[PDB]
Scaffold this active site. Structure first.
Site, PDB file in Angstrom:
ATOM      1  N   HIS A  78     -65.162  -5.028 -24.810  1.00  0.00           N
ATOM      2  CA  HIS A  78     -63.850  -4.647 -24.299  1.00  0.00           C
ATOM      3  C   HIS A  78     -62.974  -3.984 -25.354  1.00  0.00           C
ATOM      4  O   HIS A  78     -61.843  -3.594 -25.040  1.00  0.00           O
ATOM      5  CB  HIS A  78     -63.145  -5.851 -23.649  1.00  0.00           C
ATOM      6  CG  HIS A  78     -62.674  -6.922 -24.593  1.00  0.00           C
ATOM      7  ND1 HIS A  78     -61.723  -6.705 -25.567  1.00  0.00           N
ATOM      8  CD2 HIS A  78     -62.968  -8.244 -24.649  1.00  0.00           C
ATOM      9  CE1 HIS A  78     -61.481  -7.836 -26.208  1.00  0.00           C
ATOM     10  NE2 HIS A  78     -62.217  -8.787 -25.663  1.00  0.00           N
ATOM     11  N   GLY A  83     -55.293 -12.578 -31.737  1.00  0.00           N
ATOM     12  CA  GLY A  83     -56.080 -11.535 -32.365  1.00  0.00           C
ATOM     13  C   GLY A  83     -57.360 -12.063 -32.968  1.00  0.00           C
ATOM     14  O   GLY A  83     -57.727 -11.674 -34.085  1.00  0.00           O
ATOM     15  N   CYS A 116     -60.384 -12.214 -31.089  1.00  0.00           N
ATOM     16  CA  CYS A 116     -61.561 -11.714 -30.388  1.00  0.00           C
ATOM     17  C   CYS A 116     -62.590 -11.218 -31.383  1.00  0.00           C
ATOM     18  O   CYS A 116     -62.255 -10.584 -32.384  1.00  0.00           O
ATOM     19  CB  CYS A 116     -61.202 -10.582 -29.417  1.00  0.00           C
ATOM     20  SG  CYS A 116     -60.264 -11.171 -28.056  1.00  0.00           S
TER      21      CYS A 116
END
Lengths: 294, 298
Positions: free
Chosen positions: B39, B141, B143
């Site tokens: 993503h 933050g 990911c």
């Protein structure tokens, strides 16, 4: 979640130190290996060790230092308080930026638990008010160190020396000075009654408000003295004016005055949780500092 | 009895920053490939219903910015494997550990190296919940942060962080891009299912208590797997299987407490509480130690 610092910078400094039949961990920084001076003791010696007499009888070649698969050559030795400092003929190429700091009870740090020079696990803990650590110190974990990391500088604050009868651990700063009244001698010493770190609980409650949990607040306030009279009945450390000052930023950020949070804590001690949770814990957590929460 | 994370050094040396357009997250650099959540190629607008195959066809190598500390890595190829993006880079990571990609089961534990923009921040030990989520902190933050176990010098990577669920828990994939749990990498409504307690881990933790001298909850009784499972279901506990009882065998031999005897202990605790006593200095039953974890620590 109680997070430990990433341990890689310290892993590169762990070595194994053997003297006679005893092997423990050492910390290799530049051309010095630091380890507990009781590496030079047998089990018999530990009842009444005379470290000056035991050390004068050692030669450099009595100390076997292994960093992984490489033997390091010891070329000098000295004792500073309860830490042995072995000068080796090779500076550790993996030495991080570091400093040595002595911490106060309530302060947190990570421990890299090691077995015979080999890192086994990392955990976050706090120096208890009784100057002990509730750790996971496998039998041969002496010499494992505690540390904080701030902008790639490792501040070493703890070296593990002794297990106490209640299962808790005692040790020194990296200048070899014990935390608390403990000695590197097999005596009847015992951890005193431990207490909850009150300023850490209050910092954590502020974190909960910041994270959107408000159910434990109430409409009461307290004086500092009345709070301390109540909290001491639950084995909570006294809250000082310095502690109130330290929470000042978190008070301003959440708009909750410090003594108002103290009133909330008093009621939490009186009522318990009633099945609820605060930041996912069913217990009042006291191992997050006000610096940690910010 | 502390939860312990694995030493994170072997993994710290693999973390990098991946930027595509306005989006930055963490990637894992092993040899000459960087792995990260697919993503990263998605705009906020594309997230509502992305066509990842189409979106990646339209990307080129110049769309990806990879930074290893103070060093930009040049991307020379890109591909997807399920929900993981694979960026081939011009340089092999000289710090690549011996490693494997593995897929874990609910109830198993691992360490997570939480990272911000490629920079490792902390390490913690967690368990995969029965509902396939992680109760962690990510970050924000975070990911692309990864979970792992270490065996000898081999790092077994088992988790990559992809998203936070509305209840604050975390969802992700294995390193081959297969999600854990019924979640998708799209900006839609999704929720963790009702979670249960990992029964085999609670039992391991009770064996750990006895190994540590906490014995007050032991009693003279034994139960049946059948009878225990009805008490478990009534208390939101995962059912216990014969494989579970077999996995606990080493602990039952070391301590002399058979598993169905410990289950009688557990059943009694679930109905009557601790009566002011604690277990391992705790008043709740911990379920994020596996039987393997307890043996390794005891």
């Amino acid at each position: 979640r109680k997070m430990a610092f990433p341990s890689g910078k310290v892993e590169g400094c762990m070595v194994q130190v053997t003297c006679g039949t005893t092997t423990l961990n050492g910390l290799w920084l530049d051309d010095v290996v630091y380890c507990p001076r009781h590496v030079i003791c047998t089990s018999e010696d530990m009842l009444n060790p005379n470290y000056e007499d035991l050390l004068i009888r050692k030669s450099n070649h009595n100390f076997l230092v292994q960093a992984g698969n490489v033997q390091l050559r010891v070329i000098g030795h000295s004792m500073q308080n309860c830490v042995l400092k072995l000068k080796v003929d090779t500076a550790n190429p993996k030495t991080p930026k570091y400093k040595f700091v002595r911490i106060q009870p309530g302060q947190t740090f990570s421990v890299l638990a090691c077995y015979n020079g080999s890192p086994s696990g990392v955990y976050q803990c706090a120096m208890r008010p009784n100057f002990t650590i509730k750790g996971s110190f496998l039998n041969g974990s002496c010499g494992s160190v505690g540390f904080n990391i701030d902008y790639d500088c490792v501040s070493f604050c703890y070296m593990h020396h002794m297990e106490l009868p209640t299962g808790v651990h005692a040790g020194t700063d990296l200048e070899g000075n014990f935390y608390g009244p403990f000695v590197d001698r097999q005596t009847a010493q015992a951890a005193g009654t431990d207490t909850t770190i009150t300023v850490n609980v209050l910092a954590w409650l502020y974190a909960a408000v910041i994270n959107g949990d408000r159910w434990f607040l109430n409409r009461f306030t307290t004086t500092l003295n009345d709070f301390n009279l109540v909290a001491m009945k639950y084995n909570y450390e006294p809250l000082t004016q310095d502690h109130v000052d330290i929470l000042g930023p978190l008070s301003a950020q959440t708009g909750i005055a410090v003594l108002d949070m103290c009133a909330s804590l008093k009621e939490l001690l009186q009522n318990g949780m009633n099945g609820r949770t605060i930041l996912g814990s069913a217990l009042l957590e006291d191992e997050f500092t006000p610096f940690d929460v910010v």
